[PDB]
Amino acid sequence: YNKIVSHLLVAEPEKIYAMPDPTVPDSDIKALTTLCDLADRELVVIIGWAKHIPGFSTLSLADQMSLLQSAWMEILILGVVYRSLSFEDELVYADDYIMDEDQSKLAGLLDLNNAILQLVKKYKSMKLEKEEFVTLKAIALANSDSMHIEDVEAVQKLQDVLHEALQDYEAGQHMEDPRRAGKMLMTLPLLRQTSTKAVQHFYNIKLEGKVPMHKLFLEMLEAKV
């Protein structure tokens, strides 16, 4: 058993709830408000969670923030994706907020959510394990490709450390497939693609001004766009 994987499992945050307003009737704006409020709260949890990634808090505060400002949506989406693995054509944003095709349509998110489901579909083929999820989440952060990084060697060392952990996991638990680690890494492009679509989508919603969004969420949107 790999030490870094094990830490990451222990570091895995607690379940968060969307908690939509029952007094407010089902609309396209309720959904988007609900989702943005949820993302805002996830963010706080991700920022805290990143500190437990071995080597991360040893980076400069500037670099820590640069990686988080680049990778947060990837991490958010990867969480949604993992929660949705044992479901069919449905996205578990939270245990109390599962959206199907009709609900995605209403919310104006069919294109985004279909892309997230593309990601789910691929991980279901591979039978993604929780050990691999958490490690990929950490790699996504370390490999976020921020333009504003100061200590490039320290960030690359963090990438190597987390990459090695994945290689060691797959070498030990998945001998039947010598290329599984690579297969996992090859899902990261789609993760990035759908993160970017989600950021641009939720930024357009900001500009339309119909949906209230909290300070932190708006701050992390500005940074990426």
- The site for a second copy (CB under 8 A) is made up of 114-115, 118, 125, 139, 143, 145, 147, 156, 159-160, 163-164, 167, 178-179, 181-183, 185-186, 188-193, 196
Close Cβ partners of 133 (under 8 Å, ≥ 6 residues apart): 78, 82
Close Cβ partners of 183 (under 8 Å, ≥ 6 residues apart): 126, 177
Measured from the CB of residue 69, what is the shortest distance to a second copy in angstroms? 14
Nearest residue relative to Ca ion (C-beta): 12
Query: Quick one: what does residue 186 bind among a second copy, Ca ion, none, with the CB cut-off 5 to 8 Å set by partner type?
Result: a second copy
Measured from the CB of residue 212, what is the shortest distance to a second copy in angstroms? 28
Measured from the CB of residue 132, what is the shortest distance to Ca ion in angstroms? 17
Measured from the CB of residue 109, what is the shortest distance to a second copy in angstroms? 15
Residue 151 CA to chain centroid, in angstroms?
A: 24
| 73 token code pair | 């949506």
Structure-token match 């040893």, residue found: 58
Query: Quick one: what does residue 182 bind among a second copy, Ca ion, none, with the CB cut-off 5 to 8 Å set by partner type?
Result: a second copy
- Do the beta carbons of residue 16 and residue 43 sit within 8 Å? no
Restricted to residues 11-70, the positions that interact with Ca ion (CB under 5 A) are 12
CA angle 212, 109, 86 (to 5 degrees): 110
Length of the chain: 225
Query: Quick one: what does residue 189 bind among Ca ion, a second copy, none, with the CB cut-off 5 to 8 Å set by partner type?
Result: a second copy
Q: Which residues bind Ca ion (CB under 5 A)?
A: 12
